[PDB]
Amino acid sequence: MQDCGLPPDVPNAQPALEGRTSFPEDTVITYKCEESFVKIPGEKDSVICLKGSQWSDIEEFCNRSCEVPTRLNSASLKQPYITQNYFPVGTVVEYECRPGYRREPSLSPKLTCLQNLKWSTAVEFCKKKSCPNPGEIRNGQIDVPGGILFGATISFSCNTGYKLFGSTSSFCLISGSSVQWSDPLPECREIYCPAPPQIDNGIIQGERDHYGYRQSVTYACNKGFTMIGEHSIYCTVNNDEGEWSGPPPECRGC
Amino acid sequence: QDCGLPPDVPNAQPALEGRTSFPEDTVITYKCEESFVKIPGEKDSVICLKGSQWSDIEEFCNRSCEVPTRLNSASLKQPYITQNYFPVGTVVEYECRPGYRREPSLSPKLTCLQNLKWSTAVEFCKKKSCPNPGEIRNGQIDVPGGILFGATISFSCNTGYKLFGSTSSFCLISGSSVQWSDPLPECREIYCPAPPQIDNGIIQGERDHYGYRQSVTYACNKGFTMIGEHSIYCTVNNDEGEWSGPPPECRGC
């Protein structure tokens, strides 16, 4: 009769019958691989109802493959693997470095599917690129807690008596074809105390324009006056603010 | 042949020894009464002569000031320093003691007043001053009460420095002048012990010396995690250098 019966049973595949058990000549039925199975490229996945109520031949076309290789932050799959989904046991793919990573020549950039149905153990074939030497800050310091490779952070500080002007930290980020420091080296500026106080019936010996950390100002009473107090005071510096060690002396008469 | 009572001399009293009759050749001496002093080169005694007659005697006492009161700034000059006769109008001169100096604008002279009193005293001899104390590098000098003869000054070293030498000085008289009893002390920077090294970590740009408030920053080697404070600083536990706390630790992952 001009009709075929059920189509052939294909291992690990299920045919789409669409709610019927009888099919007319020239009917084309397509099979879909079952869960945990992927179709083999370059193979037939359907049958056809020919004359004599006979279905065309079909061979197993499903496997049995790894999952798509897991996403790496250091390397991307090369072509043509990057567009593939069929990875039977034994399949080996190749990677290439992303930015800002570079090859580690001693290590292979290739992975394999386990019977296991699992990709081989991952190694660091693509390593983090390094940022330039951070250099130095005059009168300050650079804190490098964890190297200077891509993704690293460094902080800046100014020695006692200096104030920091600029950025307080920098990060090694990817910059086009390489990796560079997010922010330039800041500046450590000398902190000045307020102008020293004058005193009644006394003077400051050779008063300077600016007074920095620990610098001192010496006092002297005018003729006929007695000094009561510290002969000199010095510049103290805390929390980036200058402040004199204490009050200036007094010149009492007479 | 015995004389009777000796002559009455104004402002003087004779020493009679309770006697009312005196034999020939008896010599009686008079003592000036309160406030009076005998006049140098004058007779103060009489002698009983023949004819029961006393020898003549004239007033020999002049009202006089007392020996000038002692001053600590100056001393009487010669010859006043050895004198006791100071009638009204007498002026004496002083000279400075040590360690005092002359106040050029003033007179170093005193006059006995009509009321038998020395004129008002002024500061003609003033205390000398020791030289300017100077400066102590990284330290301070406290002058609580001037730098004249007898004054005291103290020394101190700023935070982070230790005082080596004298802690005070006193303006003493030294021969022909006044000088400070002690020389300036030195204020020397205190250093903390060398900062400790840590397993599997380093000191970022270590220095050969670390003073007060100076810090040392640590960093762990690739593959280790730091546990504790990243940097420590040099404190001063008087008068010693000491690190703020323990260095961090690097734990292997």
Short mmCIF file of C-alpha atoms in Angstrom, two decimals:
data_model
loop_
_atom_site.label_atom_id
_atom_site.label_comp_id
_atom_site.label_asym_id
_atom_site.label_seq_id
_atom_site.Cartn_x
_atom_site.Cartn_y
_atom_site.Cartn_z
CA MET A 1 0.00 0.00 0.00
CA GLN A 2 1.10 3.56 -0.76
CA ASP A 3 1.96 3.87 2.97
CA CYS A 4 4.91 2.95 5.19
CA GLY A 5 4.51 1.83 8.79
CA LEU A 6 6.65 2.93 11.72
CA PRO A 7 10.13 4.12 10.69
CA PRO A 8 13.28 2.23 11.73
CA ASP A 9 14.55 2.27 15.29
CA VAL A 10 17.79 4.25 15.45
CA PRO A 11 19.96 3.85 18.55
CA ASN A 12 20.07 7.00 20.69
CA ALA A 13 17.72 8.91 18.40
CA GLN A 14 13.97 9.57 18.35
CA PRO A 15 11.94 10.27 15.24
CA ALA A 16 9.36 13.03 14.98
CA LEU A 17 6.15 11.26 14.00
CA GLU A 18 3.71 14.11 14.78
CA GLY A 19 0.91 11.93 16.19
CA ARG A 20 0.65 9.31 13.42
CA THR A 21 1.54 5.65 12.83
CA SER A 22 1.08 5.48 9.05
CA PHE A 23 2.99 7.57 6.51
CA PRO A 24 2.47 8.20 2.77
CA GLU A 25 5.10 7.63 0.08
CA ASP A 26 7.84 10.29 -0.07
CA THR A 27 7.27 11.20 3.57
CA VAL A 28 10.52 12.37 5.15
CA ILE A 29 11.07 11.67 8.83
CA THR A 30 13.85 13.36 10.79
CA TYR A 31 15.46 11.97 13.95
CA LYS A 32 16.73 13.97 16.93
CA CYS A 33 19.61 12.66 19.05
CA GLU A 34 18.69 11.81 22.62
CA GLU A 35 19.81 13.53 25.84
CA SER A 36 23.59 13.28 26.25
CA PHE A 37 23.98 12.76 22.50
CA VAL A 38 25.15 15.02 19.62
CA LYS A 39 24.73 14.37 15.88
CA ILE A 40 27.80 13.57 13.78
CA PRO A 41 28.51 16.22 11.14
CA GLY A 42 28.29 15.00 7.52
CA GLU A 43 25.73 12.26 8.22
CA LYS A 44 22.05 11.66 7.33
CA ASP A 45 19.51 12.31 10.11
CA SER A 46 16.34 11.33 8.26
CA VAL A 47 14.62 8.54 6.32
CA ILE A 48 12.24 8.47 3.36
CA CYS A 49 9.25 6.28 2.57
CA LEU A 50 10.06 4.66 -0.79
CA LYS A 51 8.05 2.44 -3.16
CA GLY A 52 6.93 -0.94 -1.85
CA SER A 53 6.16 0.53 1.60
CA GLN A 54 9.85 0.54 2.47
CA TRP A 55 11.87 3.12 4.40
CA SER A 56 15.30 4.22 3.18
CA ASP A 57 18.32 3.05 5.18
CA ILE A 58 19.75 5.07 8.04
CA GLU A 59 22.80 4.46 10.23
CA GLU A 60 23.52 5.62 13.78
CA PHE A 61 24.48 9.28 13.49
CA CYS A 62 24.66 10.27 17.17
CA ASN A 63 27.40 10.39 19.85
CA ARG A 64 28.71 10.90 22.73
CA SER A 65 30.75 14.08 23.18
CA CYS A 66 32.19 16.57 25.74
CA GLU A 67 30.42 19.72 26.61
CA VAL A 68 31.60 22.96 25.03
CA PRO A 69 34.97 23.77 26.63
CA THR A 70 34.48 25.86 29.80
CA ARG A 71 35.00 29.63 29.61
CA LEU A 72 38.56 30.73 30.46
CA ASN A 73 39.49 34.30 31.43
CA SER A 74 43.05 33.86 30.14
CA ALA A 75 42.50 32.19 26.79
CA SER A 76 39.96 31.86 24.01
CA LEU A 77 39.40 28.87 21.73
CA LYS A 78 41.06 29.21 18.31
CA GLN A 79 39.22 28.74 15.04
CA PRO A 80 37.64 26.53 14.16
CA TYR A 81 36.98 25.02 17.59
CA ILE A 82 35.36 28.24 18.84
CA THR A 83 32.30 27.56 16.63
CA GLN A 84 32.05 23.80 17.21
CA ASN A 85 29.79 21.71 19.44
CA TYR A 86 30.67 18.17 18.38
CA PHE A 87 33.54 16.85 20.52
CA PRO A 88 33.78 13.06 20.58
CA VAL A 89 36.30 11.28 22.83
CA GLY A 90 39.85 12.01 21.66
CA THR A 91 39.07 15.45 20.23
CA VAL A 92 41.77 18.05 20.92
CA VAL A 93 41.15 21.77 20.63
CA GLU A 94 43.61 24.68 20.72
CA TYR A 95 43.52 27.97 22.62
CA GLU A 96 45.10 31.36 22.09
CA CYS A 97 45.80 34.03 24.68
CA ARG A 98 43.36 36.82 25.47
CA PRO A 99 44.63 40.27 26.43
CA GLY A 100 46.37 40.96 28.57
CA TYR A 101 47.75 37.43 28.84
CA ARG A 102 50.69 35.90 26.95
CA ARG A 103 51.77 32.34 26.14
CA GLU A 104 53.84 30.30 28.59
CA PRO A 105 55.93 28.47 25.99
CA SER A 106 56.68 25.50 28.26
CA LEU A 107 52.97 24.67 28.45
CA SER A 108 50.58 23.32 25.83
CA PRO A 109 47.58 25.45 24.89
CA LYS A 110 45.52 22.33 24.06
CA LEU A 111 42.70 20.41 25.78
CA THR A 112 41.19 16.79 25.20
CA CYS A 113 37.42 15.12 25.95
CA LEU A 114 37.42 12.39 28.73
CA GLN A 115 35.61 8.96 28.37
CA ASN A 116 34.66 10.39 31.15
CA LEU A 117 33.24 12.79 28.58
CA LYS A 118 35.46 15.41 30.27
CA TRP A 119 38.09 17.91 29.11
CA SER A 120 41.66 17.34 30.29
CA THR A 121 43.15 19.19 33.26
CA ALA A 122 43.71 22.90 32.73
CA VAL A 123 47.17 24.45 33.01
CA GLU A 124 48.35 28.07 32.88
CA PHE A 125 49.50 28.03 29.24
CA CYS A 126 48.42 31.68 28.97
CA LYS A 127 49.76 33.86 31.80
CA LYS A 128 49.02 37.39 33.04
CA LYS A 129 51.06 40.12 31.35
CA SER A 130 53.15 42.45 33.52
CA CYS A 131 52.81 46.23 33.95
CA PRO A 132 55.86 48.48 33.77
CA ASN A 133 58.02 49.04 36.84
CA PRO A 134 56.01 51.46 39.05
CA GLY A 135 59.18 53.42 39.77
CA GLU A 136 59.43 55.76 42.75
CA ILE A 137 57.81 58.72 44.50
CA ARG A 138 60.25 61.27 45.90
CA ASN A 139 59.59 61.70 49.66
CA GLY A 140 56.87 59.03 49.57
CA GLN A 141 56.39 55.29 49.06
CA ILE A 142 54.61 52.80 46.84
CA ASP A 143 52.85 49.79 48.35
CA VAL A 144 52.92 46.69 46.14
CA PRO A 145 51.05 44.02 48.11
CA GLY A 146 50.66 41.45 45.32
CA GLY A 147 52.95 41.95 42.33
CA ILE A 148 52.56 44.16 39.26
CA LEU A 149 50.82 41.78 36.84
CA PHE A 150 47.54 42.39 35.05
CA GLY A 151 44.82 42.97 37.67
CA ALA A 152 47.17 44.14 40.45
CA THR A 153 46.66 47.09 42.78
CA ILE A 154 49.27 49.40 44.32
CA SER A 155 48.91 52.22 46.82
CA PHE A 156 50.81 55.45 47.44
CA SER A 157 51.74 57.29 50.62
CA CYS A 158 53.76 60.33 51.58
CA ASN A 159 56.39 60.35 54.31
CA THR A 160 55.91 62.29 57.55
CA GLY A 161 56.09 66.00 56.74
CA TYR A 162 54.80 65.63 53.19
CA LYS A 163 51.29 65.77 51.74
CA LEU A 164 50.12 63.57 48.88
CA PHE A 165 48.81 65.32 45.78
CA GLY A 166 47.31 63.14 43.04
CA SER A 167 46.09 59.51 43.06
CA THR A 168 46.30 57.34 46.20
CA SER A 169 46.32 54.04 44.28
CA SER A 170 46.81 52.53 40.84
CA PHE A 171 45.62 49.35 39.06
CA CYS A 172 47.25 47.34 36.23
CA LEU A 173 44.51 47.27 33.59
CA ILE A 174 44.48 46.16 29.96
CA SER A 175 45.36 48.97 27.57
CA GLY A 176 44.80 48.16 23.93
CA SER A 177 47.60 45.80 22.89
CA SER A 178 49.08 45.58 26.39
CA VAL A 179 48.48 46.39 30.06
CA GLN A 180 49.30 49.70 31.71
CA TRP A 181 48.91 51.56 35.01
CA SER A 182 45.53 53.21 35.50
CA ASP A 183 46.94 56.33 37.21
CA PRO A 184 50.27 58.20 37.08
CA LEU A 185 52.65 58.57 40.04
CA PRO A 186 51.30 61.20 42.48
CA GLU A 187 53.23 63.93 44.34
CA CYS A 188 54.46 64.27 47.94
CA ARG A 189 54.32 67.96 48.96
CA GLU A 190 56.10 69.50 51.95
CA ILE A 191 53.68 70.52 54.71
CA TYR A 192 54.22 74.00 56.16
CA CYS A 193 53.33 75.15 59.67
CA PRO A 194 51.39 78.41 60.02
CA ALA A 195 53.56 81.52 60.34
CA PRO A 196 55.10 81.50 63.83
CA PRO A 197 53.47 83.83 66.36
CA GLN A 198 55.09 87.14 67.34
CA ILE A 199 55.48 88.11 70.98
CA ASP A 200 55.17 91.38 72.89
CA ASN A 201 58.53 92.97 73.65
CA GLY A 202 60.46 90.20 71.91
CA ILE A 203 61.47 89.04 68.44
CA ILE A 204 62.01 85.97 66.26
CA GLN A 205 65.65 85.42 65.33
CA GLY A 206 65.93 85.49 61.53
CA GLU A 207 62.36 84.54 60.66
CA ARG A 208 62.06 82.32 57.60
CA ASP A 209 59.44 82.42 54.88
CA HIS A 210 58.38 78.80 55.37
CA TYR A 211 58.63 76.27 58.22
CA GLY A 212 58.56 72.53 57.59
CA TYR A 213 58.43 69.43 59.78
CA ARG A 214 60.69 69.74 62.87
CA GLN A 215 62.09 73.12 61.78
CA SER A 216 62.44 75.53 64.71
CA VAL A 217 61.92 79.20 65.50
CA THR A 218 64.01 80.83 68.24
CA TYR A 219 62.79 83.80 70.27
CA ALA A 220 64.66 86.60 72.04
CA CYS A 221 63.40 89.26 74.47
CA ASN A 222 64.19 92.94 73.95
CA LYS A 223 66.62 94.73 76.25
CA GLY A 224 65.15 95.08 79.76
CA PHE A 225 62.77 92.15 79.40
CA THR A 226 63.02 88.74 81.04
CA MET A 227 62.21 85.57 79.13
CA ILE A 228 59.77 83.16 80.73
CA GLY A 229 59.17 80.02 78.70
CA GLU A 230 60.69 77.95 75.93
CA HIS A 231 63.51 79.69 74.04
CA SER A 232 62.19 78.10 70.84
CA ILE A 233 59.36 76.08 69.32
CA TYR A 234 59.27 73.60 66.49
CA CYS A 235 56.88 72.46 63.79
CA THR A 236 54.89 69.31 64.56
CA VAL A 237 53.01 67.52 61.77
CA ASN A 238 50.01 65.25 62.26
CA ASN A 239 47.24 64.10 59.90
CA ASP A 240 48.78 66.26 57.16
CA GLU A 241 48.43 69.41 59.25
CA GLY A 242 51.28 71.44 60.71
CA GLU A 243 51.11 72.79 64.24
CA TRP A 244 53.68 74.41 66.52
CA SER A 245 54.95 72.32 69.44
CA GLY A 246 53.59 74.78 71.97
CA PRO A 247 53.07 78.43 72.88
CA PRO A 248 55.85 80.99 72.41
CA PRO A 249 57.60 82.34 75.50
CA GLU A 250 56.75 85.60 77.29
CA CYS A 251 58.90 88.72 77.76
CA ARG A 252 57.99 90.41 81.04
CA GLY A 253 59.33 93.66 82.54
CA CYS A 254 60.29 95.83 84.17
CA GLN B 1 94.68 116.92 146.48
CA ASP B 2 91.87 114.73 145.07
CA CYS B 3 89.86 116.19 142.18
CA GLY B 4 86.06 116.19 142.45
CA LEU B 5 83.65 115.29 139.65
CA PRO B 6 85.11 115.71 136.16
CA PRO B 7 83.76 118.30 133.73
CA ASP B 8 80.39 117.87 132.04
CA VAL B 9 80.93 117.24 128.34
CA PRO B 10 77.94 117.64 126.02
CA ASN B 11 76.76 114.34 124.54
CA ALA B 12 79.38 112.30 126.39
CA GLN B 13 79.45 110.36 129.65
CA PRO B 14 82.52 109.74 131.77
CA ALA B 15 83.42 106.37 133.24
CA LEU B 16 83.73 107.01 136.98
CA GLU B 17 83.62 103.49 138.41
CA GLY B 18 81.11 104.65 141.03
CA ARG B 19 83.64 107.13 142.42
CA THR B 20 83.08 110.75 143.38
CA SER B 21 86.66 111.61 144.33
CA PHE B 22 89.76 111.01 142.22
CA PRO B 23 93.50 111.15 143.03
CA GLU B 24 96.05 113.27 141.15
CA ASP B 25 97.05 111.90 137.73
CA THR B 26 93.78 110.00 137.43
CA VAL B 27 92.74 109.77 133.78
CA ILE B 28 89.03 109.71 132.99
CA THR B 29 87.76 108.73 129.55
CA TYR B 30 84.40 109.82 128.08
CA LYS B 31 82.14 107.77 125.81
CA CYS B 32 79.89 109.47 123.27
CA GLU B 33 76.15 109.03 123.91
CA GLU B 34 73.70 107.21 121.60
CA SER B 35 73.81 108.43 117.97
CA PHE B 36 77.16 110.17 118.46
CA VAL B 37 80.65 109.16 117.26
CA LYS B 38 83.99 110.60 118.44
CA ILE B 39 85.76 113.02 116.11
CA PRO B 40 89.06 111.60 114.83
CA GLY B 41 92.13 113.43 116.16
CA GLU B 42 90.26 114.81 119.17
CA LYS B 43 90.76 114.39 122.95
CA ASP B 44 88.25 112.17 124.76
CA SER B 45 89.79 112.15 128.22
CA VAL B 46 90.81 114.39 131.10
CA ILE B 47 93.50 114.09 133.74
CA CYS B 48 93.42 115.23 137.36
CA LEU B 49 96.30 117.67 137.83
CA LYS B 50 97.81 119.64 140.72
CA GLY B 51 95.57 122.16 142.45
CA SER B 52 92.69 119.67 142.36
CA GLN B 53 92.03 120.81 138.80
CA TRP B 54 90.98 118.74 135.78
CA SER B 55 92.61 119.28 132.36
CA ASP B 56 90.51 120.98 129.69
CA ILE B 57 88.35 119.01 127.28
CA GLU B 58 86.22 120.15 124.37
CA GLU B 59 83.17 118.51 122.79
CA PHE B 60 84.50 115.64 120.67
CA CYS B 61 81.28 113.92 119.66
CA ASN B 62 79.47 114.52 116.38
CA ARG B 63 76.11 113.00 115.47
CA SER B 64 76.87 110.25 112.99
CA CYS B 65 75.19 107.69 110.79
CA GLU B 66 75.67 104.02 111.53
CA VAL B 67 77.95 101.83 109.42
CA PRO B 68 76.15 101.32 106.10
CA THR B 69 73.94 98.21 105.93
CA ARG B 70 75.31 95.24 103.99
CA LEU B 71 74.31 94.98 100.33
CA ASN B 72 74.55 91.81 98.25
CA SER B 73 75.17 93.62 94.93
CA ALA B 74 78.12 95.76 95.98
CA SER B 75 80.66 96.42 98.71
CA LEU B 76 82.06 99.62 100.21
CA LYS B 77 85.30 100.83 98.60
CA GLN B 78 88.44 101.83 100.48
CA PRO B 79 88.68 103.65 102.68
CA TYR B 80 85.02 103.76 103.72
CA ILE B 81 84.93 100.00 104.32
CA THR B 82 87.09 100.44 107.44
CA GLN B 83 85.42 103.61 108.78
CA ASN B 84 82.84 104.16 111.54
CA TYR B 85 82.72 107.96 111.74
CA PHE B 86 80.06 109.29 109.35
CA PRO B 87 78.81 112.80 110.23
CA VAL B 88 75.95 114.40 108.32
CA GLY B 89 76.94 115.07 104.71
CA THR B 90 79.45 112.22 104.49
CA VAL B 91 79.35 110.41 101.15
CA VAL B 92 80.80 106.93 100.66
CA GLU B 93 81.39 104.98 97.44
CA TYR B 94 80.59 101.36 96.54
CA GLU B 95 82.00 98.89 94.03
CA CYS B 96 80.29 95.86 92.56
CA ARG B 97 80.59 92.40 94.07
CA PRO B 98 80.62 89.33 91.82
CA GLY B 99 78.65 88.54 89.94
CA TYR B 100 77.27 92.05 89.54
CA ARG B 101 77.94 94.80 86.99
CA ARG B 102 77.74 98.60 87.13
CA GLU B 103 74.61 100.38 85.87
CA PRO B 104 76.42 103.31 84.24
CA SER B 105 73.38 105.61 84.46
CA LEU B 106 73.40 105.38 88.27
CA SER B 107 75.58 106.57 91.14
CA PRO B 108 77.37 104.09 93.39
CA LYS B 109 77.36 106.59 96.27
CA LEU B 110 75.40 106.96 99.51
CA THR B 111 75.07 110.10 101.70
CA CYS B 112 74.35 110.36 105.47
CA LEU B 113 71.17 112.47 105.91
CA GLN B 114 70.37 115.09 108.59
CA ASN B 115 68.10 112.57 110.22
CA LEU B 116 71.21 110.41 110.66
CA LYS B 117 70.21 108.06 107.86
CA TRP B 118 71.86 106.92 104.62
CA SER B 119 70.26 108.07 101.35
CA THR B 120 67.87 105.88 99.37
CA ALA B 121 69.54 102.89 97.73
CA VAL B 122 69.36 102.32 93.98
CA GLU B 123 70.50 99.43 91.78
CA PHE B 124 73.84 100.93 90.73
CA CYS B 125 75.28 97.39 90.70
CA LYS B 126 73.11 94.98 88.70
CA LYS B 127 73.33 91.18 88.32
CA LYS B 128 75.48 90.04 85.41
CA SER B 129 73.98 87.94 82.62
CA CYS B 130 75.36 84.62 81.42
CA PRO B 131 75.86 84.33 77.63
CA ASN B 132 72.93 83.47 75.37
CA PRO B 133 72.26 79.77 76.01
CA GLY B 134 72.37 78.98 72.29
CA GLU B 135 70.46 76.16 70.58
CA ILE B 136 70.17 72.38 70.91
CA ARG B 137 69.66 70.60 67.59
CA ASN B 138 66.41 68.63 67.81
CA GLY B 139 65.88 69.79 71.42
CA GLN B 140 64.73 72.80 73.50
CA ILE B 141 65.92 75.13 76.26
CA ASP B 142 63.44 76.32 78.86
CA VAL B 143 64.26 79.69 80.43
CA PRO B 144 61.74 80.04 83.25
CA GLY B 145 63.23 83.17 84.82
CA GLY B 146 65.80 84.97 82.67
CA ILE B 147 69.53 84.37 82.27
CA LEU B 148 71.01 86.60 84.97
CA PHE B 149 73.35 85.53 87.76
CA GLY B 150 71.61 82.83 89.82
CA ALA B 151 69.23 81.67 87.07
CA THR B 152 68.42 78.07 86.13
CA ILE B 153 67.59 76.62 82.71
CA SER B 154 66.54 73.14 81.68
CA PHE B 155 67.04 71.06 78.54
CA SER B 156 64.78 68.61 76.73
CA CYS B 157 64.90 66.59 73.54
CA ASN B 158 62.04 66.44 71.04
CA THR B 159 60.01 63.29 70.47
CA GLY B 160 62.22 60.71 68.75
CA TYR B 161 65.45 62.02 70.26
CA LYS B 162 67.34 61.10 73.42
CA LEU B 163 69.17 63.63 75.58
CA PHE B 164 72.87 63.01 76.16
CA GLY B 165 74.63 65.29 78.63
CA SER B 166 73.32 67.75 81.26
CA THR B 167 69.59 68.22 81.86
CA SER B 168 69.95 71.70 83.36
CA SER B 169 72.37 74.60 83.77
CA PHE B 170 72.79 77.33 86.39
CA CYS B 171 74.34 80.79 85.96
CA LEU B 172 77.36 80.61 88.26
CA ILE B 173 80.05 83.16 89.00
CA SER B 174 83.33 82.01 87.48
CA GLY B 175 86.36 84.05 88.43
CA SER B 176 86.02 87.46 86.80
CA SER B 177 82.53 86.73 85.45
CA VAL B 178 79.48 84.46 85.30
CA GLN B 179 79.07 81.34 83.19
CA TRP B 180 76.70 78.41 82.74
CA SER B 181 77.45 75.54 85.13
CA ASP B 182 76.84 72.89 82.44
CA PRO B 183 77.40 72.78 78.67
CA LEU B 184 74.61 72.03 76.21
CA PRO B 185 73.60 68.39 75.90
CA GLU B 186 73.18 66.70 72.50
CA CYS B 187 69.85 65.61 71.02
CA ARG B 188 70.49 62.36 69.15
CA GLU B 189 68.00 60.59 66.89
CA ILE B 190 66.69 57.36 68.42
CA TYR B 191 66.63 54.35 66.09
CA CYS B 192 64.34 51.34 66.30
CA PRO B 193 65.86 47.89 66.11
CA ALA B 194 66.17 46.46 62.61
CA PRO B 195 62.69 45.50 61.43
CA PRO B 196 61.89 41.78 61.57
CA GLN B 197 61.86 39.68 58.40
CA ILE B 198 58.98 37.32 57.68
CA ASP B 199 58.71 33.81 56.17
CA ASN B 200 57.67 33.86 52.50
CA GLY B 201 57.54 37.67 52.37
CA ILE B 202 59.79 40.71 52.07
CA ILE B 203 60.30 44.27 53.27
CA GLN B 204 59.55 46.66 50.44
CA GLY B 205 62.66 48.80 49.88
CA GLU B 206 64.19 48.31 53.32
CA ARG B 207 66.36 51.12 54.72
CA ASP B 208 69.54 50.95 56.74
CA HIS B 209 68.07 53.06 59.57
CA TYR B 210 64.56 53.72 60.94
CA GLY B 211 63.67 56.56 63.30
CA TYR B 212 60.55 57.75 65.11
CA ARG B 213 57.31 57.61 63.09
CA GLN B 214 59.11 55.95 60.16
CA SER B 215 57.41 52.90 58.66
CA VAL B 216 58.30 49.56 57.08
CA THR B 217 55.96 48.00 54.53
CA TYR B 218 55.71 44.25 53.96
CA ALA B 219 54.69 42.19 50.91
CA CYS B 220 54.04 38.46 50.56
CA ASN B 221 55.60 36.27 47.85
CA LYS B 222 53.53 35.07 44.89
CA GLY B 223 51.17 32.37 46.17
CA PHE B 224 50.86 33.53 49.80
CA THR B 225 48.19 35.50 51.70
CA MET B 226 49.14 38.16 54.27
CA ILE B 227 47.75 37.82 57.79
CA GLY B 228 47.99 40.89 60.04
CA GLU B 229 48.96 44.54 59.48
CA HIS B 230 50.74 45.30 56.18
CA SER B 231 53.16 47.87 57.61
CA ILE B 232 54.50 48.77 61.05
CA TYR B 233 56.02 51.97 62.39
CA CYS B 234 58.83 53.03 64.70
CA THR B 235 57.46 54.22 68.05
CA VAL B 236 59.48 55.52 70.96
CA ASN B 237 58.96 53.81 74.31
CA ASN B 238 61.01 56.27 76.28
CA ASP B 239 63.64 56.67 75.58
CA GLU B 240 63.76 53.55 73.39
CA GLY B 241 62.87 52.68 69.78
CA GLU B 242 60.16 50.01 69.45
CA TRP B 243 57.95 48.71 66.61
CA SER B 244 54.22 49.43 66.81
CA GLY B 245 53.43 45.70 66.68
CA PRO B 246 54.23 42.33 65.10
CA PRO B 247 54.81 42.00 61.34
CA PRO B 248 52.12 40.31 59.24
CA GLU B 249 52.34 36.62 58.37
CA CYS B 250 52.27 35.00 54.95
CA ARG B 251 50.04 31.92 54.66
CA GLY B 252 50.60 29.52 51.75
CA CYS B 253 47.65 28.69 49.50
#
